[PDB]
Amino acid sequence: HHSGLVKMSHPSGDVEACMVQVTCGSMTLNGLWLDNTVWCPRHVMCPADQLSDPNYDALLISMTNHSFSVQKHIGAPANLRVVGHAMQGTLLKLTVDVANPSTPAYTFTTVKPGAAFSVLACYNGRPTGTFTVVMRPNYTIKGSFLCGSCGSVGYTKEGSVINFCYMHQMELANGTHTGSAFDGTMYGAFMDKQVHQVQLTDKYCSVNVVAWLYAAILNGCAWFVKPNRTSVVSFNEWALANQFTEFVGTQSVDMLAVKTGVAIEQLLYAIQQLYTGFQGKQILGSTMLEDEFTPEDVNMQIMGV
Amino acid sequence: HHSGLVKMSHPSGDVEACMVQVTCGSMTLNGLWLDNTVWCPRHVMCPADQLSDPNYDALLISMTNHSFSVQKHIGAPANLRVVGHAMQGTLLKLTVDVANPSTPAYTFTTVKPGAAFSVLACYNGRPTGTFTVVMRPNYTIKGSFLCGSCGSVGYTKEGSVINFCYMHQMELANGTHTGSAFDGTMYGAFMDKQVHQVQLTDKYCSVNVVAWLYAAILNGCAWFVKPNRTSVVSFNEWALANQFTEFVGTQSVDMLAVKTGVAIEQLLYAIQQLYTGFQGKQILGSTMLEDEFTPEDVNMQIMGV
Ligand SMILES: *[C@H](O)[C@H](C[C@@H]1CCNC1=O)NC(=O)[C@H](CC(C)C)NC(=O)OC[C@@H]1CCC(=O)N1Cc1cccc(Cl)c1
Ligand SMILES: *[C@H](O)[C@H](C[C@@H]1CCNC1=O)NC(=O)[C@H](CC(C)C)NC(=O)OC[C@@H]1CCC(=O)N1Cc1cccc(Cl)c1
Ligand SMILES: [Mg+2]
Ligand SMILES: [Mg+2]
């Protein structure tokens, strides 16, 4: 029995119309064109012989408006003249002489661990694929990015407003990925330098495991539900010793509790038991806990909220 | 260690610009507007009191051009006047008086079991999400569709050409989904009537399991590779008794064999052993065989082909 859950991304068209290619010297990557600004990773300025220890302040001062080439390829092709440049943290803000006529309503936000967002993967300013990820507790994502993908963007959508939350920068040794928010800060403790870096421990996202257990109940799969309960405070002490995030309830989780009649604390107890082993049973076709679906995913995809 | 694989859909913008809402009486669902034609499921003509045994021939003859309302909501809003109507299998072909100015280059094709395609889920003519599925051996997909989603479309893309392959029609009792190709045939033995239907057995897609094992090797995970080999003919006899599809090699699989230096027949042997149990080990974080990634997915996402 299929749960009705899939990895569901936002439709990408509004963001596709904002992707451009940015070239500086021998480096090329993607940028995001909104109004008269093009955002891109600052390492586009870095020659390959300096990627391990760039002096971005000196690289910035070495630039002229003539140093940057910006091109839009699809739909409404254009070469965009750069008329100013500035650095914000790990991003460049290029000012261009044409305002993007397809600029959507937008904001910039930071995404938190456990929350999902959609990514538009792009190469040479051309969108090639879209996928959804959850921000991990260690501020990486389990993405799919190759050389040339930097400047690919991640976003959520509220109504017609696009909330841009991620610009892709790097791949870590364990195959995960990280990038910057549009305030220019890297997620986590990462730096935009080509050196090996400490990656913090990942953890199971407890709130998302709870969501998935609710999805199981909504599909008639409830063998793991017992009268037994663990309080949020007690579960959270356990979580710290067992590589789980501390649980913080939300209205979205509460809606699942009301619909199913199963209390959060019943599922916190179930998690503690299931973490020790599923005893040969499956939940929604899985023999391990799943944390890649959010309470909102379950509310939207199964309950049609 | 993350494999670098995600469920990767095509960018959806070109298809978003083709989605419309179609209403006939009390029924509303989605349609696809290409050139001067709008395709939609024929059950838009059916009143709720007849969904279990519609007489579609009589329903069709009962229609006039005045029976259909077609509306485009996003981007370039429009009410489209219907000037003709016809039925092709389980689809209606409505002729409208305006050609869609955003019609992409396109073809219609049928997708085969094991192959992946992208879906644009829509409600009331408004795109709401995108996801990717593989056509199952029993001609269902494991999608995410609710009331109002019929007429949502699935497609692949070759260069700039969109190959439309699926129009959504129904949900089966086990939570999976099916629909029609654009020749109007339903996938499988299904009928577009609101009655319970025999669903054929699903099977593991052997070629996709092979692909995933190659993805594991490309990530340094090869504990399951031994000198032992099973021939394609021998594996295929085994597959018939063990709920696997028969294996048919392709150039895409051969590219993985060349890159890794591991023969297909080594992985056919591994599958037979792994099907009996993983012995407490994991492959790419999983304790069961994975068949939801294609050889092309692995070539593109990991090898950048
Ligand atoms: C931008 O297009 C790419 C995207 C990468 C390429 C492969 N997949 C991706 O997601 N980004 C990079 O190439 C960055 C650029 C720096 C300036 C941020 N480099 C990168 O990710 O490689 C270095 C990474 C940094 C963390 C780490 O562990 N790295 C490996 C490493 C460390 C030290 C030396 C070397 Cl040669 C590699
Ligand atoms: C179109 O928007 C919907 C999409 C569905 C709704 C829920 N999720 C979806 O994917 N399609 C339908 O409602 C179809 C319409 C018919 C005319 C094709 N109906 C449908 O899928 O429900 C009936 C299905 C058919 C196979 C089956 O097992 N069904 C259950 C069933 C059987 C007999 C009677 C009843 Cl009331 C339901
Ligand atoms: Mg990798
Ligand atoms: Mg369901």
From Swiss-Prot, chains A, B:
Domain Peptidase C30: 3-305
Domain of life: Viruses
Catalytic activity: TSAVLQ-|-SGFRK-NH2 and SGVTFQ-|-GKFKK the two peptides corresponding to the two self-cleavage sites of the SARS 3C-like proteinase are the two most reactive peptide substrates. The enzyme exhibits a strong preference for substrates containing Gln at P1 position and Leu at P2 position
Active site residues according to the UniProt entry: 43, 150
Function: Cleaves the C-terminus of replicase polyprotein at 11 sites. Recognizes substrates containing the core sequence [ILMVF]-Q-|-[SGACN]. Also able to bind an ADP-ribose-1''-phosphate (ADRP).
Protein's name in the database: 3C-like proteinase nsp5
Organism, as annotated: Middle East respiratory syndrome-related coronavirus (isolate United Kingdom/H123990006/2012) (MERS-CoV)
Full-protein residues shown: 3248 to 3550 of 4391
